[PDB]
């Protein structure tokens, strides 16, 4: 599909209008995921430039979308200061305005959510390289390519969109993207992948090793159960003409003794690996990946750990907040796994 990547390059006025609105939010509210801001977020998002809202709406209803990319948001590199050395330190005063702007864009597509078991239950999260995590399977890696995945593939409450706001990317490190062409894998493999014949485990970002030590053990019970005793699930669902994709290259296995399944997965892993194409998010670029249609990852790179490294703000978006109420503390709470 020629519009699988939908791009909007902001005019100077559109960039300035979006920055003014984000700065007005930072003037009013404490955190870019403060409860009062999130209650207000859908309507405040309506104040984004009309031409931009029109293109975001076209992307939202495009069921073959890979990513919407909004290029050319204002990012003041000097005002922003150094790239923090850990996501725990990345809730900086100077970066608030970019968290608010990410939530405003995201709220055109759905409702923002976070995870009790990821980055201490923050809704606005950070992607930056961490010294000692170079060879990890988590988004703070650098030397080892981030393996392609559906975000939170293990969960029925996985996002419909993953939002990425690039604050800085001096070495032009690519985000990787791939969809599935059913015609190129075969009706045979599609049929197998549509069967509940696979195990998808929570990735390592959901482990207590990637959260603050004080975070409640109760939050992690469900994750540990999903690692030990994964449910039998499909990789494909929906219409045969526009099927949804759910798979993590490093956390997905066929159910024991299902050689057909093991072979379908093997064939899917080889097909997605080669199809993987590059999208570079420069400073001020906001992307929304359709997590129903594509797997994504990140090319290997050398981090400098000198305060100049690549830094994204990130958010999960659901089309339907109500559906996850069983996993949320209360109606307005956005943190999946607090119930």
Ligand X SMILES: N=C(N)NCCCC[C@H](N)C(=O)O
Cα-Cα-Cα-Cα dihedral of 43, 49, 50, 52, to 10°? Answer: -100
Strand partners, 231: none
- 64 scored as a contact of a copy of itself (CB under 8 A): yes
Give the strand pairing for 67-71 and 5-9: parallel
Distance of CA 309 to the CA centre of its chain: 20
Three-state DSSP state, 38: helix
Residue 176, annotated as binding a ligand: no
Residue 151, annotated as binding a ligand: yes
- 300 scored as a contact of ligand X (CB under 6 A): no
Q: Which of 235, 226, 142, 227 is nearest to 182 (CA)?
A: 235
**By CB under 5 A, what part of segment 151-180 binds Fe ion?**
151
- 120 scored as a contact of ligand X (CB under 6 A): no
Residue 271, annotated as binding a ligand: no
- 63 scored as a contact of a copy of itself (CB under 8 A): yes
Tokens 């801001």 locate to 37
Rounded Cα distance between 268 and 256, Å, is: 18
**Segment near Fe ion (CB under 5 A); pick from 18-26, 63-71, 149-157, 325-333:** 149-157
- 137 scored as a contact of ligand X (CB under 6 A): yes
- 138 scored as a contact of ligand X (CB under 6 A): yes
* DSSP alpha helix (H) spans, 143-258: 182-185, 187-193, 217-228
107, 150, 249, 318: residue in contact with ligand X (rule CB under 6 A)? 249
- 39 scored as a contact of a copy of itself (CB under 8 A): yes
Give the strand pairing for 252-254 and 125-127: unpaired
Q: How far is the CB of 174 from Fe ion (least distance, A)?
A: 13
Residue 199, annotated as binding a ligand: no
Task: Please state, in angstroms and as integers, the Cα–Cα distance from residue 199 to each residue in 234, 246, 281, following that order.
Answer: 9, 11, 32
Polymer length in residues for the chain: 339
54, 86, 231, 270: residue in contact with a copy of itself (rule CB under 8 A)? 54
Residue 241 binding: pick among ligand X, a copy of itself, Fe ion, none (C-beta 5-8 Å cut-off by kind): a copy of itself
Tokens of residue 230, six digits: 């994964």
- 31 scored as a contact of Fe ion (CB under 5 A): no
Task: Give me the half-sphere count of Cα atoms (radius 13 Å) on the Cβ side of residue 218.
Answer: 6
**By CB under 8 A, what part of segment 210-239 binds a copy of itself?**
238-239
Give residues in contact with Fe ion (CB under 5 A): 151
Give residues in contact with a copy of itself (CB under 8 A): 39-40, 42-43, 46, 50, 53-54, 57-58, 60-64, 111, 160, 238-239, 241-242, 244, 292, 319-323, 325-326, 328, 330-332, 339
Give residues in contact with ligand X (CB under 6 A): 118, 137-139, 146-147, 149, 151, 203, 205, 248-250
Binding residues for Fe cation: 149, 151, 296
């Amino acid at each position: 599909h020629m519009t699988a990547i939908r791009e909007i390059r902001l005019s100077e006025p559109e960039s300035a209008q979006a920055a003014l609105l984000a700065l007005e939010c930072a003037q009013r509210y404490a955190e870019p995921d403060s409860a009062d801001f999130l209650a207000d977020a859908a309507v405040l998002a309506h104040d984004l430039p009309r031409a931009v809202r029109r293109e975001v709406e076209r992307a939202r209803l495009d069921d073959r979308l890979h990513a919407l990319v909004v290029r050319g948001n204002d990012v003041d590199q000097d005002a922003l200061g150094p790239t923090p050395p850990h996501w725990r330190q990345a809730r900086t005063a100077a970066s608030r305005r970019y968290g608010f702007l990410l939530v405003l864009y995201a709220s055109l597509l759905g409702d923002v959510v976070g995870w009790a078991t990821q980055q201490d239950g923050r809704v606005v999260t950070d992607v930056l390289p961490i010294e000692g995590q170079e060879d990890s399977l988590v988004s703070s890696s650098s030397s080892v390519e981030l393996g392609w995945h559906t975000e939170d593939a293990f969960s029925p409450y996985r996002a419909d969109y993953v939002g990425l706001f690039s604050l800085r990317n001096p070495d032009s490190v690519a985000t990787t993207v791939a969809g599935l062409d059913p015609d190129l894998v075969g009706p045979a493999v599609v049929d197998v992948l549509f069967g509940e014949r696979f195990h998808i485990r929570p990735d390592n970002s959901h482990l207590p090793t990637h959260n603050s030590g004080g975070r409640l053990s109760d939050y992690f019970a469900g994750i540990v159960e999903a690692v030990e005793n994964p449910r039998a699930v499909s990789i494909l669902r929906g219409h045969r003409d526009a099927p949804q994709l759910c798979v993590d290259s490093d956390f997905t296995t066929a159910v024991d003794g299902d050689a057909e399944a093991a072979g379908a997965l093997d064939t899917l892993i080889k097909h997605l690996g080669g199809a993987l194409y590059e999208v570079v998010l420069g400073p001020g670029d906001v992307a929304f990946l359709d997590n129903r249609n594509v797997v994504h990852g990140r090319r290997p790179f050398r981090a400098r750990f000198d305060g100049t490294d690549r830094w994204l703000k990130r958010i999960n978006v659901t089309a339907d907040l109500r559906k996850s109420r069983a996993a949320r503390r209360d109606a307005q709470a956005r943190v999946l796994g607090e119930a």
